[PDB]
Amino acid sequence: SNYPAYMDNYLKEVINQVEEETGYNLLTTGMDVYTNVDQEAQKHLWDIYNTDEYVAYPDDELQVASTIVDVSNGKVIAQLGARHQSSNVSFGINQAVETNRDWGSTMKPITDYAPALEYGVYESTATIVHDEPYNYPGTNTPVYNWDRGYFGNITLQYALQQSRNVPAVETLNKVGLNRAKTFLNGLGIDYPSIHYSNAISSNTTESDKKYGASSEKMAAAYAAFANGGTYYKPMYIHKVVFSDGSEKEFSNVGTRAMKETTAYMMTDMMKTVLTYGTGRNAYLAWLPQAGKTGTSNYTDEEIENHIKTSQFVAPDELFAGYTRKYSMAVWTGYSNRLTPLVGNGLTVAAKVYRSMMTYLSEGSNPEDWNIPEGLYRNGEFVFKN
């Protein structure tokens, strides 16, 4: 024995964060490290992943990777990048932190809508947007919705709820690429160069751990919504003790990335995603929470030469939700993007989220968010004073 299997991923990042911070590799240098991982939470997550006691998987090769963050300090309390993957070699690639996969629509809240309300492009969640034939700015390439259809004049909250692409890209045009990119920096996310395609895709040209999105980064980002607009750099360690006796404490300093009002508005709209939208498989009548779903697609080449079914398919299915205490981003798909997620497999990400959040909150007495000063309700929407 050396270390349990369920901590492989977590321990991998600890080694790295200590390395980045102090500059020493604890595998060749004696140190005592106190981490933020919630052992019991980890264990439970592992069972959700590797057992059939919580979620019905279509098979054992389907993958999952998620990260749970404490929205009050950015501490990563649980993380796991793969399931039923026992190719024992320690600290292999941890998918929870890799930004090689597309997070689709989970990018809409932080890349289009948050910035819009933040910068005054929209004054309320009732604002009327446009889901009509529309081409990517500066091109004749059309922006398609999954059903290749259009709802026309719908409200901001409804556009998000049903995850309509047109309104999202259009919104990104009104917000402006440069400040949309600056707004993501406030949430830890960045691209080499941002493009309109990023209004609904995290797909980027350069492949680094920094560019794009990963469960790790998405959770930290959404944590900002939950706590009122403050972004905390994800942390795996909070203290290390060198063999000499001197110690190092790591601070959870948070930076405001959006107004208190913007956060409440985004949150308000995102809970309707779980109630009447795409994220209905993660809904809990007793838990005040909000989230967003995402589905990536296959290229034409892929659909014709590699996809052998007429069933709705995708290489990636994602969910990123949060309660008032915890933020969790989930990723699902196969190591080989060419193996699609089908029917039952697509509900996996949401259900994995629901199971974990149940575990983390059913015991406590969860509180809701309170309408901050500067906004007022009016039936189903929220407006600025």
Place this chain on the structure above:
Amino acid sequence: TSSKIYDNKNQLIADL
């Protein structure tokens, strides 16, 4: 070289 690692409840979880 040996490095002990603890969780958030400050209880040992690994030694490397």
